[PDB]
Amino acid sequence: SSFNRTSFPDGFVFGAASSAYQFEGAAKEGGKGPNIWDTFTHEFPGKISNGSTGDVADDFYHRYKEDVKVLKFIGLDGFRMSISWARVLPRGKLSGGVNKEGIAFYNNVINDLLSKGIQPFITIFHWDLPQALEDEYGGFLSPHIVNDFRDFAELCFKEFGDRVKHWITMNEPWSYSYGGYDAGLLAPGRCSAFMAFCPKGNSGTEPYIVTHNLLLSHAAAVKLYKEKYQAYQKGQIGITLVTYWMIPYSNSKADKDAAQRALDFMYGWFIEPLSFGEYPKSMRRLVGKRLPRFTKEQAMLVKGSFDFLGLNYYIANYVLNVPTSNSVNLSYTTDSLSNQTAFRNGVAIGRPTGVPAFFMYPKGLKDLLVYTKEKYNDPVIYITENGMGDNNNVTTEEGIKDPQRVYFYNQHLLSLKNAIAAGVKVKGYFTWAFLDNFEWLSGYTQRFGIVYVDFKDGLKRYPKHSALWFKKFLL
Numbered sequence: 001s002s003f004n005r006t007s008f009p010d011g012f013v014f015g016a017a018s019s020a021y022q023f024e025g026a027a028k029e030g031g032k033g034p035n036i037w038d039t040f041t042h043e044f045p046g047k048i049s050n051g052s053t054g055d056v057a058d059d060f061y062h063r064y065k066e067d068v069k070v071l072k073f074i075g076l077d078g079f080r081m082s083i084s085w086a087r088v089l090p091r092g093k094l095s096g097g098v099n100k101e102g103i104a105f106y107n108n109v110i111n112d113l114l115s116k117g118i119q120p121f122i123t124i125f126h127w128d129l130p131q132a133l134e135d136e137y138g139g140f141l142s143p144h145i146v147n148d149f150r151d152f153a154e155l156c157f158k159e160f161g162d163r164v165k166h167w168i169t170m171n172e173p174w175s176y177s178y179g180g181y182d183a184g185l186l187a188p189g190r191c192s193a194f195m196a197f198c199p200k201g202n203s204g205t206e207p208y209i210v211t212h213n214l215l216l217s218h219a220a221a222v223k224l225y226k227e228k229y230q231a232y233q234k235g236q237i238g239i240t241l242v243t244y245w246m247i248p249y250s251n252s253k254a255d256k257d258a259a260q261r262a263l264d265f266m267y268g269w270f271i272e273p274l275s276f277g278e279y280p281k282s283m284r285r286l287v288g289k290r291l292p293r294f295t296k297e298q299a300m301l302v303k304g305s306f307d308f309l310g311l312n313y314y315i316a317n318y319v320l321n322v323p324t325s326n327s328v329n330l331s332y333t334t335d336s337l338s339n340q341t342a343f344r345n346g347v348a349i350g351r352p353t354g355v356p357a358f359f360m361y362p363k364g365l366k367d368l369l370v371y372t373k374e375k376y377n378d379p380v381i382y383i384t385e386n387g388m389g390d391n392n393n394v395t396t397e398e399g400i401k402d403p404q405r406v407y408f409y410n411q412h413l414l415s416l417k418n419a420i421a422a423g424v425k426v427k428g429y430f431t432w433a434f435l436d437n438f439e440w441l442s443g444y445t446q447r448f449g450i451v452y453v454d455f456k457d458g459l460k461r462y463p464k465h466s467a468l469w470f471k472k473f474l475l
């Protein structure tokens with residue numbers, strides 16, 4: 001006898017997650033065109049650990065049949081995966097033509113998943129923007145992205161919507177904006193010149209520009225799905241957001257307010273437009289005219305534009321107030337006057353993982369969910385990512401034994417259970433990740449999978465103890 005799925009609601013969806021650039025490989029194969037991550041990893045090897053790329057990744061593009069067998073072996077209800085925009089539309093625009101070989105790959109994966117009784121949860125956009133669109137008008141820096149995003153979504157609805165019943169417009173627009181345009185840590189790698197880190201950009205203005213267009217693009221796809229496809233395809237559409245849970249470093253009003261500002265700027269930036277059609281008051285106050293306004297039309301489009309909310313949860317941080325100052329480092333990051341740290345009084349917020357900044361704090365998952373329920377009218381929620389990373393610095397034999405990850409999932413699922421007990425309408429949960437994969441700026445130095453991938457020996461797959469723990473949990 002042990003903790004198992006019967007403790008969760010009937011029909012609850014347990015799954016594992018993936019994304020196209022991180023898993024697929026075949027970056028220049030099967031008619032696929034270039035995307036901004038091809039470009040970023042090739043042109044800035046200094047920004048990826050060991051100068052790695054997703055050229056091959058897990059080679060999920062060729063190995064998907066064997067991988068789907070692993071999903072079935074674990075016994076999962078669902079699988080979260082994304083569509084490579086430049087694989088299906090190599091020139092970004094619909095008028096640039098649809099790549100039949102790219103459509104065929106996703107159809108093949110979906111049909112195999114369904115034969116195993118696994119529901120595909122499809123992320124339309126997981127950061128891999130076609131280089132053609134980045135080149136033409138600067139990608140999400142331009143309002144032109146909205147119409148092209150809408151057409152890409154429509155292509156997905158038309159080709160896959162007869163079988164796909166859960167759509168996620170985009171993964172973590174916070175990450176795309178902050179990482180791509182404030183810190184320059186992610187493609188397209190833009191930031192202010194004073195950071196001496198990116199060729200082009202403005203960390204004080206571009207993140208706000210990009211976030212606005214991310215929201216409008218999302219809203220365009222949702223409007224189209226609901227008005228044209230939802231009634232006869234009978235699916236649901238949402239968006240995946242990420243936030244840290246923010247804890248005041250001390251009991252002071254200063255730190256309490258700082259914690260809420262940090263949450264406002266990371267989470268509220270997206271969930272308040274989605275819920276209320278406006279940005280958080282703190283952002284309006286502190287960012288001023290660098291923060292775009294929603295026109296009345298835009299607000300109507302964005303407000304209420306989700307059937308469900310996808311939430312990605314990894315960590316919590318303590319937050320300190322940062323006093324105003326005279327030194328002029330203009331950025332989205334410094335705009336919130338907040339400072340996050342994993343340590344209080346010299347003590348870490350939880351158990352360590354193989355990722356330096358990341359400690360275990362399962363309580364924060366429930367805290368986030370209750371906060372979301374209470375502030376945003378009790379939405380339907382899927383946990384679309386939750387997981388931990390190991391440092392890739394031991395043998396295959398050792399990496400497969402991951403009691404730390406078994407511990408991680410036991411504690412987080414117990415916390416999730418308590419959130420459901422508190423009335424949060426959670427309907428599903430997805431492990432990041434299915435396989436050890438290309439972890440963006442960290443390359444292959446960090447392993448998040450419940451399944452091990454031996455990159456040094458034919459990309460061979462081996463279920464970890466965590467996979468076997470889930471297998472048992474899922475009966």
Ligand SMILES: *[C@@H]1O[C@H](CO[C@@H]2O[C@@H](C)[C@@H](O)[C@@H](O)[C@@H]2O)[C@@H](O[C@@H]2O[C@H](CO)[C@@H](O[C@@H]3O[C@H](CO)[C@@H](O)[C@H](O)[C@@H]3O)[C@H](O)[C@H]2NC(C)=O)[C@H](O)[C@H]1NC(C)=O
Nearest residue numbers: 001002003004005006007008413414417418472473474475
């Ligand atoms: C699937 O899981 C259920 C529930 O598991 C319980 O709740 C989870 C949230 C975790 O905290 C688990 O650690 C916890 O056990 C299992 O049913 C439960 O089995 C336990 C025994 O392991 C029962 O506790 C015992 O009950 C007897 C009386 O029958 C007492 O004499 C014992 O001292 C002890 O208290 C528990 O009552 C029971 N709960 C329910 C709701 O039935 C279930 O066995 C498991 N299934 C499989 C196949 O593993």
Ligand SMILES: N=C(CCCS[C@@H]1CC(=O)N(Cc2ccccc2)C1=O)N[C@@H]1O[C@H](CO[C@@H]2OC[C@@H](O)[C@H](O)[C@H]2O)[C@@H](O)[C@H](O)[C@H]1O
Nearest residue numbers: 019171172175179185186242314355432439440441442446
């Ligand atoms: N990685 C992110 C957010 C990137 C934000 S920009 C910058 C880079 C980064 O990882 N960190 C921290 C972070 C990590 C995860 C979530 C939020 C914030 C940043 O703030 N989100 C999810 O995390 C998953 C695990 O991300 C790893 O987290 C630890 C990092 O060291 C590693 O590079 C990253 O790939 C990704 O694989 C998913 O594709 C993605 O949806």
Ligand SMILES: *[C@@H]1O[C@H](CO)[C@@H](O[C@@H]2O[C@H](CO)[C@@H](O)[C@H](O)[C@H]2NC(C)=O)[C@H](O)[C@H]1NC(C)=O
Nearest residue numbers: 351352353354355356389390391392393394404
């Ligand atoms: C492999 O990487 C892990 C993770 O970085 C190392 O374990 C960490 O060691 C540091 C330094 O002593 C500690 O501060 C952390 O608490 C450890 N993290 C854990 C255990 O999750 C490990 O030492 C590395 N091993 C080798 C051989 O390099």
